[PDB]
Design a protein around this nucleic acid. Structure first.
Ligand SMILES: [Zn+2]
Length: 609
DNA sequence: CAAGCTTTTTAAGA
DNA sequence: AAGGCCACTCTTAAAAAGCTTG
RNA sequence: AUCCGGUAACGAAACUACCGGAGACGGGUUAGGAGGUGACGACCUCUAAAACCUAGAACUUAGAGUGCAAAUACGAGUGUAAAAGCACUCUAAGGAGUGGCCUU
């Protein structure tokens, strides 16, 4: 793709006349999608328990756009089947709507009322992306995580039968690879004979019921197995968060959310005065007609049509008058090899606090359509990634680590947890959220169990949504974006300064080799003149300043800097098994004590040299 | 009771 | 609660329900 | 209550201790720096900040500039006369997010 974003704050971009609508739209969109996703998930379970396994001439259920859209209509209180016209295929849609509506009645333990969920926002286009994004989540989850279900039912079966844990993984690993070329898998789909991996991409819906079946077995069938080995997966994703999610607003979405006939006529009057061309727009329905109908003639180029959207954005928003216009007015960054010129793409993603402007190359702007020797001179460093010590970088004589605690302090994790708990406690949800919803597992695939979670939440949905609608939760989301870059960038500057100057001490370290000693003395004045040797495994934001290379990680944690043999082992003989403390097993060592980061980082640098 | 107009929302579109 | 991966980045003609006029 | 660095123990660890700095999301209010006599301290004034309250702004990394806050000695013994930190501009280096899932 050729799309980039400029994430900033939403203040001032939307006029005060429409700021209330945008924030309310975000709340409404989250409520509709969050409830609709649960209804869709429950509806799928209804089908699974009522029609799985299928008959010889029955089709495996495939979710589409209209399934989720109907769920949104049901959540909004719509009882009339939202189907256009009468026909064979349209008849199927009407029947599907009735099935979902009946399930909605069963899901909640009281009679639905129409005038308890009514809304006055035209979120039809805004909700479309959440429908597509949710639908894509189902496909992504099936394709990228189905193998995990395969490697878990077999593992649980082996454990349930008393076999050793080590052998269970052996059987599961071999079985999964073999099936790439026993009832957990569907019949081979591709008639061309390609491996099963191609079939998974060809049709994800066929494999979706298989995951649901596996989850049911984990909850009840494998009772004897320890719970730690039966962590439930989520075959059917749904929006479980209560903090409002970011909505996507396009030219069509913005056009119908913040316009009326009185305002629409103003746009025509303003457009006529500035451009002198009358627009063939009669009402809010014909507003989004094609360029040919609006002007009566085809645009000279796609750019001309795109510019029409930009002008409409200007009338509805402060795109050309707000602070953020500095970064959107054809800004060309200094060091782009191609000299790309970036301009607003007529698309914005926002949640009422943070705003994400879409910016694309000027050449491609318009309406869219459906579809080696540097090692000698550079200074070399070794790096060993992790998850507690995120990065451990050493020059062979000294080491610096980017500990997870450093990022937490930079991102103010303790305060964010402190503030979030206080708001939850203040609203009285602490005695309910931690006590009730924690027991009923939301991942449960049993309709009875999942229904209990759904209705239990519904009794406190109003309180829960309002508590998390506070801007503090969304403001923290921007802080982590802001401070996370600061923490990483700040460490990058430290990396240069530490190794920028020749080492002033060369005696305290003993085991350093001659080649490594020479490297440490090099003087470097630029970020790009330092090469860091990374492992096979944050690096994306390090390559912008520091050149990088890959070093094998084979036995890096066992080999000793002092010896060709792996004489290192975890510390022993002390009251507590200290986490990363390492000690040699023999006296033939220039150094006895070692740390995992120092020892691991040293080996990576040594292999590079 | 008849007709015009507006506005959500559908639905195809590779 | 936090780090990694995968997918996506949507435009337009119209059906039908609701409202106004006498 | 957390991060970095150093001291010892033949490159040292969230129960080994000691030594020196950092910092506390955005807004209301506390205690600390600075000034009538660039004396002390009594009061007054600029600044600023956590306990508590709160629907709430902000792309990031190093530096360089500008601009701060105002009212002891004579005489024919005795009177009286720049710091913490805040904001703006630069150079040069970066500069795509949303949603779901997995894992701990
Ligand atoms: Zn050794």
């Amino acid at each position: 793709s050729n799309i980039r974003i400029v994430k900033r704050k939403a203040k001032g971009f939307f006029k005060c006349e429409d700021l209330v609508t945008i924030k309310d739209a975000v709340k409404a969109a989250h409520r509709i999608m969050s409830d609709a996703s649960i209804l869709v998930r429950s509806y799928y379970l209804r089908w699974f328990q009522s029609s799985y396994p299928l008959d010889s001439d029955d089709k495996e259920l495939e979710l589409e756009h209209f399934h989720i859209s109907m769920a949104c209509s049901i959540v909004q209180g719509i009882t009339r089947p939202p189907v256009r016209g009468v026909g064979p295929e349209q008849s199927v849609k009407i029947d599907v709507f009735n099935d979902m509506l009946d399930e909605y009645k069963r899901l909640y333990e009281r009679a639905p009322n129409d005038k308890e969920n009514e809304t006055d926002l035209s979120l039809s286009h805004v909700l479309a992306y959440s429908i597509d994004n949710l639908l894509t989540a189902y496909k992504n989850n099936i394709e990228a995580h189905f193998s995990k279900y395969v490697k878990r039912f077999i593992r649980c079966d082996m454990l349930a039968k008393g076999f050793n844990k080590s052998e269970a993984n052996r059987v599961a690993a071999i079985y999964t690879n073999a099936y790439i070329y026993s009832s957990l898998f569907p019949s081979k789909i591709n008639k061309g004979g390609f491996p099963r991996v191609y079939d998974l991409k060809a049709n994800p819906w066929v494999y979706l019921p298989k995951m649901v079946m596996i989850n049911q077995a984990l909850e009840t069938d494998f009772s004897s197995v320890e719970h730690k080995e039966r962590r439930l997966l989520n075959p059917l994703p749904f929006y479980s968060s209560f903090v409002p999610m970011h909505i996507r607003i396009d030219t069509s979405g913005l056009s119908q959310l913040l316009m009326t006939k009185d305002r629409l006529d103003d746009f025509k009057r303003s457009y006529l005065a500035e451009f002198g061309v009358s627009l063939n727009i009669k009402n809010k329905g014909d507003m989004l007609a094609s360029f040919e109908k609006i002007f009566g003639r085809k645009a000279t180029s796609n750019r001309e049509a795109g510019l029409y959207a930009t002008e409409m954005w200007s009338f509805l928003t402060n795109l050309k008058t707000c602070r953020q216009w500095k970064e959107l007015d054809g800004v060309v960054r200094k060091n782009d090899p191609k000299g790309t010129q970036w301009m607003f793409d007529n698309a914005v993603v926002t949640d009422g606090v943070s705003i994400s402007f879409q910016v694309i190359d000027n050449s491609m702007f318009g309406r869219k359509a459906f579809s080696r020797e540097e090692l000698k001179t550079s200074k070399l460093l070794g790096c060993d990634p992790g998850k507690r010590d995120i990065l451990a970088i050493t020059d062979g004589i000294k080491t610096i680590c980017y500990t997870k605690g450093q990022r937490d302090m930079d991102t103010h994790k303790t305060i964010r947890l402190r503030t979030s708990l206080k708001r939850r406690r203040g609203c009285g949800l602490e005695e309910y959220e931690t006590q009730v919803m924690n027991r009923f597992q939301k991942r449960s695939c049993h309709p009875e169990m999942f229904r209990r979670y759904a209705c239990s939440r519904k009794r406190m949905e109003h309180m829960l949504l309002e508590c998390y609608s506070h801007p503090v939760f969304r403001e923290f989301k921007f802080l982590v974006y802001n401070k996370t870059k600061s923490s990483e960038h700040r460490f990058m500057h430290r990396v240069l300064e530490t190794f920028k100057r020749p080492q002033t001490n060369l005696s305290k370290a003993r085991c350093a080799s001659g080649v490594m000693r020479m490297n440490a003395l090099k003087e470097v004045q630029r970020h790009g003149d330092i090469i860091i040797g990374w492992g096979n495994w944050i690096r994306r934001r390090f390559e912008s300043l520091f050149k990088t290379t890959t070093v094998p990680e084979h036995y890096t944690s066992q080999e000793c800097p002092s010896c060709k043999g792996r004489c290192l082992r975890k510390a022993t003989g002390n009251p507590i098994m200290r986490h990363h403390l390492l000690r040699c097993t023999n006296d033939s060592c220039c150094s006895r004590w070692w740390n995992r980061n120092v020892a691991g980082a040293f080996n990576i640098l040594t292999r590079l040299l």
